Write a protein that binds this DNA or RNA. Structure first.
Ligand SMILES: [K+]
Ligand SMILES: [K+]
Ligand SMILES: [K+]
Ligand SMILES: [K+]
Ligand SMILES: [K+]
Ligand SMILES: [K+]
Ligand SMILES: [K+]
Ligand SMILES: [K+]
Ligand SMILES: [K+]
Ligand SMILES: [K+]
Ligand SMILES: [K+]
Ligand SMILES: [K+]
Ligand SMILES: [K+]
Ligand SMILES: [K+]
Ligand SMILES: [Mg+2]
Ligand SMILES: [Mg+2]
Ligand SMILES: [Mg+2]
Ligand SMILES: [Mg+2]
Ligand SMILES: [Mg+2]
Ligand SMILES: [Mg+2]
Ligand SMILES: [Mg+2]
Ligand SMILES: [Mg+2]
Ligand SMILES: [Mg+2]
Ligand SMILES: [Mg+2]
Ligand SMILES: [Mg+2]
Ligand SMILES: [Mg+2]
Ligand SMILES: [Mg+2]
Ligand SMILES: [Mg+2]
Ligand SMILES: [Mg+2]
Ligand SMILES: [Mg+2]
Ligand SMILES: [Mg+2]
Ligand SMILES: [Mg+2]
Ligand SMILES: [Mg+2]
Ligand SMILES: [Mg+2]
Ligand SMILES: [Mg+2]
Ligand SMILES: [Mg+2]
Ligand SMILES: [Mg+2]
Ligand SMILES: [Mg+2]
Ligand SMILES: [Mg+2]
Ligand SMILES: [Mg+2]
Ligand SMILES: [Mg+2]
Ligand SMILES: [Mg+2]
Ligand SMILES: [Mg+2]
Ligand SMILES: [Mg+2]
Ligand SMILES: [Mg+2]
Ligand SMILES: [Mg+2]
Ligand SMILES: [Mg+2]
Ligand SMILES: [Mg+2]
Ligand SMILES: [Mg+2]
Ligand SMILES: [Mg+2]
Ligand SMILES: [Mg+2]
Ligand SMILES: [Mg+2]
Ligand SMILES: [Mg+2]
Ligand SMILES: [Mg+2]
Ligand SMILES: [Mg+2]
Ligand SMILES: [Mg+2]
Ligand SMILES: [Mg+2]
Ligand SMILES: [Mg+2]
Ligand SMILES: [Mg+2]
Ligand SMILES: [Mg+2]
Ligand SMILES: [Mg+2]
Ligand SMILES: [Zn+2]
Lengths: 190, 111, 151, 49, 51, 127
RNA sequence: UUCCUUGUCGCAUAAGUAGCGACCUGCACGAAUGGUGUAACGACUGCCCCGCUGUCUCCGACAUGGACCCAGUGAAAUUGA
RNA sequence: UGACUCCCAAGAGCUCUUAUCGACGGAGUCGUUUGGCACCUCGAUGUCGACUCAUCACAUCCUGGGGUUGAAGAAGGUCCCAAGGGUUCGGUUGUUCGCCGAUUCAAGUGGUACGUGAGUUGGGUUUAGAACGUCGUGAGACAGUUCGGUUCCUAUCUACCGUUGGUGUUAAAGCGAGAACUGCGAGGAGCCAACCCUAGUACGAGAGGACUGGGUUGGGCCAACCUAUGGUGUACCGGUUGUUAUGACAAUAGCAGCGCCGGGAAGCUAAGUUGGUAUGGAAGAACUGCUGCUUAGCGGGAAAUCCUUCUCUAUACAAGUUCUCGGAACAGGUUUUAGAACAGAACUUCGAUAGGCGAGAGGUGGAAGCACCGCGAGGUGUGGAGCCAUCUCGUACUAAACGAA
C-alpha cells in the first residue's frame, strides 16, 4: 500500500507501517520517544478540544451556494440571470475587478478547524472519543485533535506529556469515562 | 465501511443497554398508546399523553414515533424519541386496523 | 450502486436494458459499449438467479423483464442447470476495441462456463457458511505489522 | 464580444503548445495474431478453446 | 510601519531599503542586491575572505 | 413562521377574534411558538376591551410549525393562535400582563423558559 | 380636464402622492368637435375582497435538453501593428 | 452659490460674553447643490428609479475612549479621539426625495461616469397610435395630463474567481522521486441587545436611580455538519384511472413525457443541529498625570494599530528544512469520502476496489398459491407475508497483475 520511500522511512524509524501521518508542534518538555503509543486517555472527559479536518467536497459551485448571494427574481421579466452574481465592480475608476471578488469556483474539500469542541465520553478499551456536535469531514477520513486554544484546559489535570499506560493492562478491564456534569440540575433552578 | 460498522456496533450496544433497564413495548402505526412525559423545560413537569400512533421510524437508539390527539378541541401532534429517558411509562391501550405505515390523512379527517 | 443514465429517459433506458439482456441470453455473447455492458451484467445476473429460484413467482417476475419465450425457457432450463452450483458471477465482460465513428470503447459481454467462452472460468465453488466477523478493534490489533527487511 | 486585434502566430503557437499529442508509454503486441494494442484490450483466446 | 518598529523588527532591512532605491532600476539591480551582505552585529561568516 | 400578513386566532377573552401580524419582535424570519408579535386587530366582538384596528401585542401559544424540544421531542398544532398582552408600557420588555383573564385551548411548555409566566398561570391545558 | 396640489373633509388601511364619496377656489368643464347618466358587453385602464399559490420571507431536492469531455465534420461579427 | 470650519463679540443666558448660543461685519476649506465656461467624445460615451454586487473618505448615525457643562444621580448638551464591525421591514407614489406605520444599538453624510443595462429590469422620461385641457386661422404645439408602445452580442486582451501542466531552485544516480514540515509574506476573523447579581447600593429632601465587576438568555453575522426533524428522493414498495398486448383465466408489460395518488432509506439540503463572535503581549489616539526647569523625559491610556488563535503560503530566485527510495516514481485497470477535463484518495490477485451471490438492517405494508365465509363486490387465515432504492457484514464466482509481461 506504500511507496518504497515511505516504506523506507517507516523502516528506518523502526515503527509499524501507518496509513496517515501528521506533524504536531510541541514544546521541548512535551517530546516523546519514537515508538510511543498514544491512546484516547491523552484527553480528559469534560475538557475542550480543537478538531481539524478536510471538509466535505462540493465541486464547482455558484455564488448563491458559495457566498449566500441573493440572485435575481424568478419572474417580473428577469432574463437568464436568476442565480448570477450581478455587478462585479464600478465603471472606469477603478476600471478593474478588485482582488477577492466573490465569484464561482471550487467549494469545500478544504482544511477547517472547529474550536472549543466538548469531549463528552472517553472509551479507552476501543480508543473511541465521544465529542459533542459536528466535526468537519467525511466518514472514514482523518481528523486531528489538539487542546482547545480558546477554552484552555486545566494544566494540573492533563496527563503530561501524554498518558503512559502500563503494559500489564487488559483491554477488557477498562470502562468508559463520562464527563462529570455536576450535581446541580440546570432545569430546576430557573 | 469500517466507520459505519463501528456506528452500528455502538448503536446496537446502546439499544441493548436501555432495554435491560426499562420496558419499552412494540409500537406500531394505529396503536392507541398512553404515556407519561416529563418535560425538563417546564420544571420537569410530568403529564399523561394519550393518542394514536400516526408515524414511526426505526433508527436504533434514535427511533421516533408520532402521536396525534385532541387537547381541548385543538389537534396536537407530538413526536417522541422512543428511547428517551423522559418517557417514564408506555402502555398500549388499543390497536386500530390500518392499511399503511403513515396516517397523515388523519390530519385532514374531520374527527 | 451507481445507476447510469446512459443519456436516455427512464422508459427508453429500461426498454434498452431489457432488450440487451434478452439479446445476450439469445446469442450468449454480444458486443456493445463498455458502459452499457457494465449496466447489463447486473441485470443478466439477476435473470440467471431468477431462473435458479425456479418458482412460479420467479417465472412471473422474469417474464416481466426479458422478451421472448425462447429467452425465458433458456433461462429457466439451460442456465438453471449450468449455473446451479455457481454462487454469482455468471457473466464476463472484456474490453476489445475502439469503435470507428464515435471512438466508443467496445466490450464483449458473455455468459460463462460454456463452450467457446473467452477465458476458462474457475470451477463453480459453493460459498462457505457465513463467518461471524471479528471486531474492528481486534482486527486492528491483528493488522499491526512492520516493514519487511529489504535493505 | 469580438477580438480587438488579430492574434499573432506567436500567441497562437503558445496557445496550441500544450495541446500537442504525446507518445503512449506502454504498447502490447500479441505474438499470435500480431495485433498492436493498449493494455487491458482483448484480442485472442488461447488454443483448445 | 514606522522606522522604530522596523528597527526593532529587523534593522538590516533599513539599510537594504535605503540602498535599493538608490540603485538604478534595471535588471542588474537584484544582482547588485545579492552582493549587499548586511549584519546586525559584529559577526559575519566571511572571515576567510580578503577583507 | 408567523410574519407580516399572517392571520392568527385570538384565544383569550380580550374581545378580539382575529389579528394580522405586523412583525415578530425578534427574529429575521418571523416568530415561532412562544414568541411575541406586533399585530393589528381585524375582527373584534362588539363589547370587549380591544377594538378593531388597534395595534396590539400577542404571544404565540399555538403554531402550525413544529418546534423541537431539549430531549429531541417535537410539538405541532393545527392552527396559529395568540394571547394578547399589554403594549402601552414599552419599557417592561419582560413578562407582560395579559389583557384578558381566561385562556382557551392548549398552551405550550415553552412559555416558562421564555418567561410568559402569567399566561402559563392562566392556562388550563398544557401541551 | 386642477398648475398650486400629496387642496380640504369623509370611508378604508397599523400606515393609502392610490381608489371611492364629498366640497367648489372650474390655472384652463359644458350641451350633436354633443352635456349628463345608463342595463348589457370589453385579451381596454384603475381600486378593494375571498380562493389560491416559490411572486416573496428564502430558497432546496429531483427530472430532461444544452454547457463539460472524447471521436467525426466545421461557421461568425472583429482585426494599423 | 452651497456645505463645513474659523475670527470679532453687541446681546441672550437671574449674576455672568464664549455651559448653550450669538446681531453688525470679516478669513478660509471642500468640490456633493444651484450655476458659469464649452477643452474631449456627434464614422454613438444607451437615461431616472428599482434589483444584484459592492468599495472608499470621515465633516461619526450606533457601538468604544475622553475634556467641559447652566454635569447631584438617571437622562442629556457640547467639543475632542476613533472608520474595527454595523446601519430594518412595510403603506401611497415610476419615483430619488419625502411623509406615514411598526421597529432598532443606530436606521449617517458623501465619492466611485449623480458606481454598477456586453450583470437583470423597463414603471417615469424621450419616436411613430389615441384622448383631454390650453395655445395656434391651420398644418401642429405644451417645458401640462392620460392609456399603449422589439432592451442584440458565442469574451480576443487586461482584471478577477477556481483548477491543473510545464519550468528554475547541482544533488553526485548528466540526478530522478515519495512523504513530513518551517512560514518571508498574504488573507480571514472583528457585532449588539435585554434580563439578573453586585444593589434598591453610590447620589438624592423625595420621586427616582448608577459607574465598575460578574453571569444568563436572545438577535445578527460567520465557519461547518446530517444523528434526529422537515423538504426532495424519475431503475424502491403499495393503491388506482384510460387503453394496447401476452387468446381467455391468472400474473404482468408499454404509453398517458414518474399517468395519477399514499409512503419512502441513502445522498443533498435548512426551516434543523453544532462551533466562533476569544486570550495574552507590544506600541500607543484624544485625554490624563509625575519629574524637571525651559531644551524636555517618563507613566497610564479605546470596538482603532502590530503580533498571537484560524486559512493559504519556498517561482520566499539569498529559490529553505528533515526522513526515505534508487526496476524508484509514474502510467494502465477497478473505484471513490474527491471530481467539468485535469487533480486528490483507496484498491490492483499472498486481493473485498467495483459487480454478483448470501445474511442482516432499513423502506413498504400483508405477495402468489391454497383453504374457509359470501349470490356478489369482497372478507378471513396460512403469515410482520412478499418485494427491493440503499447501508453493513460474509464470500474471489466475474472484472481489477488472466503480468508465462
Ligand atoms: K381643465
Ligand atoms: K348623448
Ligand atoms: K378589449
Ligand atoms: K474641483
Ligand atoms: K456625441
Ligand atoms: K460614540
Ligand atoms: K460628554
Ligand atoms: K455608497
Ligand atoms: K442599468
Ligand atoms: K461596456
Ligand atoms: K489589453
Ligand atoms: K431525508
Ligand atoms: K402498485
Ligand atoms: K396498464
Ligand atoms: Mg433574498
Ligand atoms: Mg430567489
Ligand atoms: Mg428576450
Ligand atoms: Mg428565466
Ligand atoms: Mg485601465
Ligand atoms: Mg454518510
Ligand atoms: Mg534577490
Ligand atoms: Mg397634480
Ligand atoms: Mg389619509
Ligand atoms: Mg374623487
Ligand atoms: Mg371640449
Ligand atoms: Mg357643438
Ligand atoms: Mg361622445
Ligand atoms: Mg470535437
Ligand atoms: Mg459643472
Ligand atoms: Mg469609433
Ligand atoms: Mg474625526
Ligand atoms: Mg450622569
Ligand atoms: Mg463603513
Ligand atoms: Mg394593500
Ligand atoms: Mg417606496
Ligand atoms: Mg449612475
Ligand atoms: Mg451612492
Ligand atoms: Mg456596463
Ligand atoms: Mg447579458
Ligand atoms: Mg416605460
Ligand atoms: Mg383653438
Ligand atoms: Mg406611460
Ligand atoms: Mg441583456
Ligand atoms: Mg507571517
Ligand atoms: Mg451553511
Ligand atoms: Mg439529515
Ligand atoms: Mg440518517
Ligand atoms: Mg424525514
Ligand atoms: Mg385478469
Ligand atoms: Mg407504447
Ligand atoms: Mg402512442
Ligand atoms: Mg412514462
Ligand atoms: Mg411519492
Ligand atoms: Mg417524502
Ligand atoms: Mg506617553
Ligand atoms: Mg500600556
Ligand atoms: Mg523552492
Ligand atoms: Mg479520479
Ligand atoms: Mg465486495
Ligand atoms: Mg418493516
Ligand atoms: Mg403487488
Ligand atoms: Zn492476439
Amino acid at each position: 500500500h506504500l511507496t518504497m520511500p515511505e516504506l523506507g522511512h517507516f523502516r528506518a524509524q523502526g515503527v509499524p507501517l501507518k496509513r496517515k501521518l501528521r506533524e504536531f508542534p510541541v514544546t521541548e518538555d512535551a517530546l516523546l520517544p519514537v515508538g510511543t503509543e498514544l491512546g484516547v486517555r491523552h484527553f480528559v472527559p469534560g475538557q475542550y478540544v480543537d478538531v481539524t479536518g478536510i471538509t466535505r467536497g462540493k465541486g464547482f459551485q455558484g455564488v448563491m451556494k458559495r457566498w449566500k448571494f441573493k440572485g435575481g427574481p424568478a419572474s417580473h421579466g428577469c432574463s437568464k440571470a436568476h442565480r448570477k452574481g450581478g455587478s462585479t465592480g464600478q465603471r472606469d475608476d477603478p476600471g478593474k475587478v478588485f482582488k477577492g471578488r466573490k465569484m464561482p469556483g471550487h467549494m469545500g474539500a478544504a482544511q477547517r478547524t472547529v474550536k472549543n469542541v466538548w469531549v463528552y465520553k472517553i472509551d479507552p478499551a476501543r480508543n473511541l472519543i465521544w465529542v459533542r456536535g459536528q466535526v468537519p469531514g467525511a466518514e472514514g477520513n482523518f481528523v486531528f485533535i489538539n487542546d482547545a486554544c480558546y477554552k484552555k484546559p486545566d494544566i494540573s489535570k492533563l496527563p503530561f506529556p501524554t498518558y503512559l499506560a502500563p503494559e500489564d493492562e487488559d483491554p477488557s478491564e477498562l470502562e468508559p469515562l463520562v464527563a462529570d456534569l455536576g450535581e446541580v440540575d440546570p432545569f430546576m433552578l430557573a | 465501511k469500517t466507520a459505519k460498522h463501528i456506528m452500528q456496533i455502538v448503536d446496537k450496544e446502546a439499544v441493548e443497554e436501555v432495554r435491560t433497564r426499562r420496558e419499552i413495548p412494540e409500537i406500531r402505526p394505529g396503536y392507541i398508546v398512553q404515556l407519561k412525559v416529563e418535560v425538563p423545560e417546564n420544571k420537569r413537569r410530568v403529564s399523561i399523553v394519550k393518542g394514536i400512533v400516526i408515524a414511526r421510524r426505526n433508527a436504533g437508539l434514535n427511533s421516533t414515533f408520532r402521536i396525534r390527539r385532541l387537547v381541548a378541541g385543538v389537534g396536537v401532534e407530538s413526536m417522541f424519541p422512543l428511547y428517551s429517558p423522559n418517557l417514564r411509562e408506555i402502555k398500549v391501550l388499543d390497536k386500530k386496523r390500518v392499511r399503511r405505515a403513515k396516517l397523515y390523512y388523519l390530519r385532514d379527517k374531520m374527527n | 450502486t451507481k445507476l447510469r443514465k446512459l443519456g436516455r429517459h427512464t422508459g427508453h433506458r429500461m426498454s434498452m436494458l431489457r432488450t440487451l439482456v434478452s439479446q445476450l441470453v439469445k446469442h450468449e455473447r454480444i458486443e456493445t459499449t463498455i458502459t452499457k455492458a457494465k449496466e447489463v451484467r447486473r441485470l443478466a445476473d439477476n435473470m440467471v438467479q431468477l431462473g435458479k429460484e425456479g418458482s412460479l413467482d420467479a417465472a412471473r417476475r422474469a417474464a416481466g423483464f426479458v422478451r421472448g419465450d425462447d429467452v425465458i425457457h433458456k433461462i429457466f432450463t439451460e442456465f438453471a442447470y449450468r449455473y446451479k452450483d455457481r454462487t454469482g458471477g455468471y457473466t464476463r465482460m472484456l474490453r476489445t476495441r475502439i469503435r470507428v465513428g464515435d471512438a466508443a470503447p467496445m466490450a464483449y459481454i458473455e455468459f460463462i462456463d460454456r463452450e467457446n467462452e473467452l477465458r476458462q472460468s474457475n470451477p463453480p465453488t459453493p460459498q462457505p457458511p457465513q463467518r461471524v466477523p471479528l471486531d474492528p478493534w481486534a482486527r486492528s490489533r491483528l493488522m499491526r505489522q512492520y516493514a519487511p527487511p529489504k535493505e | 464580444a469580438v477580438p480587438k486585434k488579430k492574434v499573432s502566430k506567436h500567441k497562437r503557437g503558445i496557445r496550441n503548445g500544450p495541446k500537442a499529442l504525446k507518445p503512449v508509454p506502454v504498447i502490447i503486441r500479441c505474438r499470435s495474431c500480431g495485433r498492436v494494442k493498449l493494455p487491458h484490450f482483448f484480442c485472442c483466446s488461447g488454443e483448445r478453446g | 510601519r514606522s522606522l522604530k518598529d522596523q528597527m526593532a523588527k529587523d534593522p538590516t532591512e533599513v539599510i537594504r531599503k535605503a540602498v535599493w532605491r538608490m540603485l538604478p532600476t534595471n535588471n542588474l539591480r537584484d544582482d547588485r542586491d545579492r552582493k549587499l551582505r548586511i549584519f546586525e552585529g559584529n559577526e559575519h561568516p566571511f572571515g576567510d575572505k580578503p577583507l | 413562521f408567523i410574519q407580516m400578513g399572517t392571520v392568527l386566532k385570538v384565544v383569550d377573552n380580550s374581545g378580539a377574534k382575529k389579528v394580522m401580524c405586523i412583525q415578530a419582535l425578534k427574529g429575521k424570519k418571523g416568530a415561532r411558538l412562544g414568541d411575541t408579535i406586533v399585530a393589528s386587530v381585524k375582527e373584534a366582538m362588539p363589547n370587549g376591551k380591544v377594538k378593531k384596528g388597534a395595534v396590539v401585542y400577542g404571544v404565540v401559544v399555538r403554531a402550525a410549525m413544529q418546534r423541537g424540544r431539549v430531549d429531541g421531542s417535537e410539538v405541532r398544532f393545527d392552527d396559529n393562535a395568540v394571547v394578547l398582552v399589554d403594549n402601552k408600557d414599552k419599557k417592561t420588555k419582560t413578562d407582560r400582563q395579559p389583557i384578558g383573564t381566561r385562556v382557551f385551548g392548549p398552551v405550550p411548555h415553552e412559555l416558562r423558559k421564555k418567561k410568559h409566566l402569567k399566561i402559563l398561570a392562566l392556562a388550563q391545558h398544557i401541551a
